[PDB]
Amino acid sequence: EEASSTGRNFNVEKINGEWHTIILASDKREKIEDNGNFRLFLEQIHVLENSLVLKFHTVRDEECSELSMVADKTEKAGEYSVTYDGFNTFTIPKTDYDNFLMAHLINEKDGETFQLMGLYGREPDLSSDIKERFAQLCEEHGILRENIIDLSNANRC
Numbered sequence: 001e002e003a004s005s006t007g008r009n010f011n012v013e014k015i016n017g018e019w020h021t022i023i024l025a026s027d028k029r030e031k032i033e034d035n036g037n038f039r040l041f042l043e044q045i046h047v048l049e050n051s052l053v054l055k056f057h058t059v060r061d062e063e064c065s066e067l068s069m070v071a072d073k074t075e076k077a078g079e080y081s082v083t084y085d086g087f088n089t090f091t092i093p094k095t096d097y098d099n100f101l102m103a104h105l106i107n108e109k110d111g112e113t114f115q116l117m118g119l120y121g122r123e124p125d126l127s128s129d130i131k132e133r134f135a136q137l138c139e140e141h142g143i144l145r146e147n148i149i150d151l152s153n154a155n156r157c
C-alpha cells in the first residue's frame with residue numbers, strides 16, 4: 001500500500017522508524033552537493049502527536065555529524081514546516097511505508113526559493129524501478145537528470 005500525506009488514507013504512524021537517503025534532487029544543485037547543507041542523510045523518523053522528529057547526519061569528508069530537527073504539522077494536511085537555512089515546508093507525495101518514501105520540500109529564505117525531492121528507503125538501496133519512478137516525478141516538478149544525485153552507497157557512516 002501506497003499513500004500520499006495529502007491523501008485521506010495516510011497513516012503517518014508507519015512513516016515511523018529507520019529510513020535512508022537514497023537519492024536527492026534539487027532545483028539548485030548546490031544544496032544537494034558535496035558541501036551543500038540540504039545534503040542530509042536521514043537516520044530515523046520518530047512520529048509525534050503534531051510533530052515529527054527527524055534525526056539525520058551530515059558527512060564532511062567521511063566524518064559524520066548528527067542533527068535532529070522538529071518539523072511540525074502546518075495547517076494543510078500531510079504538510080509540515082521546519083526552520084532550517086530558512087523556512088521549510090514539506091509533504092510526502094508518495095510512500096508505501098514499508099519500503100520507500102519520496103519527499104518534496106520547499107525552502108523559502110530571504111525571498112529566494114528552491115525545491116528539493118528525496119527518495120528514502122527502509123534499507124540503503126532501493127531498485128532501479130523506484131529510482132526511475134522517483135526520476136520521472138522530479139521531471140514533472142521541473143528537475144532534470146543532472147540535478148538528481150544517488151547517494152545510495154555514500155549514505156553510510
Ligand SMILES: CC[C@@H](C)c1nccs1
Pocket residue numbers: 040042054082084088090103104105118
Ligand atoms: C529537511 C527535511 C527533508 C530533508 C526531509 N526529511 C525526511 C522527510 S523530508
